[model samples]
Target: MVHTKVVIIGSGPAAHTAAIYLSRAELKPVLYEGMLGQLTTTTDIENFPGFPDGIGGAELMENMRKQSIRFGTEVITETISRVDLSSKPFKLWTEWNDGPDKEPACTADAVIIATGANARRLNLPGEETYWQNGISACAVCDGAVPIFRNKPLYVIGGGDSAAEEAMFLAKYGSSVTVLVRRDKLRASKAMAKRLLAHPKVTVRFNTVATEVLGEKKPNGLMTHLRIKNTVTGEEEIVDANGLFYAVGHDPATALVKGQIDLDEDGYIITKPGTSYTSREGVFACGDVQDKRYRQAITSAGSGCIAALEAEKFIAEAES
Candidate 1:
């Protein structure tokens, strides 16, 4: 099996950001930019800094890939099937060659887990057609766009995230409506109280979205939504400019689930204010470890931290 000083597992801003730093430090890092990550499906990314005009999500990620390679990072477009972080010089297996009894593809002195989380989607009837056009999972990321201004926005979820997203969208949208499948909110008492008391926010309990309706044109945006009442079998269409889903996110932590310590929500449990994980030489960053702030900027920031910490760990080991 091949060996490397550092191995980064992921393909988003966090992965490339760490690669850039580690490669620049002469670590000769190997990055496995997996085939499917959350950022690949994103159409536009206006929130990431350095692009005032904004950049397409795929384009931004590709640019980061190029930058990482230019600095000396070896990039691999493959999905990691398994990992053995039980000891130092962690072993990893790729999909093509991994089997029940087979040699690992490579080993590394330190491993950086940047596998980001995926925002949960309801898979409504028209969700695919209007995902980025009029329906988005991140309200804070897409709320300030022109199409949602002074328009009715909708959020789906019953937790603090849903309440927070609805309130954030209310600043731009004329009104915000939250659709909770249950009869009551699962958010904390303070957040629930604020959500119920908001003037521009409406919490519809026992409501579910059946479909997302939008204009029937090329690159058309969503204009309305079809909703259903779970308890009454009532159905209605409402005018809407944007739909946000805050149901929750699934952290891509299956690779190291039992190998490392995780929080109640399944996010990697890092040493407070540091990227050190339960196992030495194994660090986690990006949405994999951060559940509160899933922003790209924050992910990249955490990636930098992981890279620096990993570099120090490697240096200390060698010394």
Candidate 2:
């Protein structure tokens, strides 16, 4: 049976960061580079630290992955198919050696889950054409782009997240309009009041974007949006330079779905202010457990924490 001091199941900044620290601690953590993380989808990342000129999202991730391997981390390519965390010596199986009779691909004294999360899509017409052209899921990440500066922007969703995005976008955009599918907001009373009072924000209740209209040129920017009033069924097209989706996010936690404890949103539940998960030997880091502050720098900090805690636990177990 293959086993190690720790098994990390992700390849994001979080996982690589953890591996580097654990390797330095002489734990020899093994990592399964499963599905690539969110940064790989981005073009230029301006928020991640240590770079004022900005860095290509793919290059940054690849460099981080290599850094951990250079520190003595044993990286694997197969995806983690399953995990068994009922007791000590947590078990994990790769896609190839997964069966009732076959042994688990690896066992570990500690496990760190950095699987990450995904932005939910709206599937509206022209969405594919305008993706990254004039449409994005992250307001804080994409709001600073030059394309949104002084341009009319739009946001979908009626919750606190939408309010936050609208407010943030207002800093760079000429104006911000929030589209709500229902008559009332899902945001709390204070947030609703604050968002309503914002001078640059226009809250459109009972309205939904029917389609995204953009320029005809290849990979052209979106120019207008088609919205329909849910109550009156009246449709109107208006100028829209950018659209930000704050609908929701889905955490990647399928492997440990039933075996580990997850919160209501299907995100791994970590101890407040720490990476400690429900099980004693299992820990969660990065976007897998963090819904707030999902920045690359923040995930890396949490990954370091996971490594510290895992090393302490392994040392105690060995003693």
Candidate 3:
């Protein structure tokens, strides 16, 4: 069995930051940058600091991976399917050796769960082909793109996030329309008021997106959206250059759902102002523990915190 001082599970900015710090601390951290994850699918990243002109998301992650390895972090390309955090020297099993009948393939003195959350998608028709082309889940992350500028955009959801996203997109898009599956807005009074008052925004209640339509060219983007009036069964196609999903995010917590303490939303519960988890030897960072600020910079900041705390914990344990 392979054993390490620290194991980092994820491939985003957070996981790479943790590995970089831990490796420099002489921990020889092992990082599992899963074959498929949130960061891998992102085509462009413009908000992260130190990149004044913007960079490709995959390129940014590759650079981080190289930096961690330069500091002696072992980067693995497999996904961690299971973990045991009930006892010390926490156990973990990769996809190859997962399930109750199998044993853990590796053990670590400290584990940092950085696996990030994924934005929920409605799976509307053509969503797969137009994803990142004209359909994105993060309005804050992709709202300012040229394709959406002065173009009609649509947002899905009825909660605070939906309201927030719609307003944000209004800054760039010519008009922003929010589709609410329910009859009324679920956002707070203040937010609802602001959203309704925005001149560039429109809210349609009891409406849902039935399909996403676009050109069939080699490199096509969403040009129109097929929407339905749930109350009247009326369907129509409208000019829409972009579609943003504000439904919510699902944090990657299935690996440690019942093993550690989680909030009502399934996010890892960490001590306020610290990265300490319910399990002493196990820690969590990034989107796994943070649902509010899901930006790459914030996630990277949390990773730094986790690395420092993990280092201190390991030092104390060895003493």
Candidate 4:
């Protein structure tokens, strides 16, 4: 049986960051890039800090991965289909050896699960064409790009997130327009009033985006949006530079569904400020445990926290 001091499962900034820390500590961490994260589908990463003019999605991951390997982190390509975290030295099974009665493929003294919470997208007509170019799910992440500067930006949603994003995008865009299917805004009593009073923001109630229109060239940005009035079947194409989706996200916690305790939204609940989950030796980082601030830098920060916390737990056990 292949056993390791620590096992990290994930394929993004979180897992690679954790592997870098743990391997440098001489923990003999084995990482399985199971590949479940927003980076897998993302085209560009402009807000990851420290990178001048931004970087491609794959380039960022490759840099982090190389750093992890430099520290002697063992990398695996197999997907971990199952995990038995009921006790210490948790049992893990790869997809090839995964089944109801199959023995474990590997075990770990400590486990770090850094899976992600995928952002929701509308999948509009041209959404695929301008995913990262002009359409984005994160307001703070992509709202401040050069294309959005002083240009009209649109946000889709009625709840606090969209209500919140409308105001956030206002900082970079000339005007921020929000599309909500409901007449009333779904925000805190205080926030709703604030949004209504915001000068540069417009709430187009009972409206939804039907399509996204952009240039026909490669790597072109979306320039227009086709919006429809929910009350009337009237569709109008409006000049738009960017569209941000404030929809919610879905966490990836299926691997530890019954093994650990998750919140109502399926996010792993860490112990307050710590990375320690309900299960002692098993730790969770990245978006899998973070419901708020689901940014790449944020995930990398949490990955560092999890590594430190896990190291402490392992050290305490040896004493």
Q: TM-score ranking from best to worst? A: 1, 3, 4, 2
Summarize candidate 4's per-residue lDDT along 68-141 as a digit string, tens digits: 99999989888899998767579999987899999888898899999878888888888888888899888877
Model 2: residues with Cα > 4 Å off, grouped in runs: 215-219, 232-234
Candidate 4: C-alpha RMSD after superposition = 2.0
Model 1 agreement with the true structure over 92-143: per-residue lDDT tens digits: 9999788879988889989999989989898999999998999888877888
Q: Is candidate 1 or candidate 2 better by lDDT?
A: 1
Once superposed on the true structure, which residue ranges of model 3 sit more than 4 Å away at CA? none
Which 10-residue window in model 4 sums to the lowest lDDT? 35-44
TM for every model, in the order presented, reads: 0.96, 0.92, 0.95, 0.93
Best to worst by lDDT, what's the order?
A: 1, 3, 2, 4
How much lDDT does candidate 1 score?
0.89
Residue-wise C-alpha lDDT for candidate 3, range 4-81, written one tens digit per residue = 998999988889899999999998999988866576667788887889899888788888889999999988788888
Q: Rate the local accuracy (lDDT) of all candidates.
A: 0.89, 0.88, 0.89, 0.87
Which candidate do you rate higher for lDDT, 2 or 3?
A: 3
TM-score of 3: 0.95
Itemize residue pairs with steric clashes in candidate 4.
none
* Residue 20 accuracy (lDDT) in model 1: 96
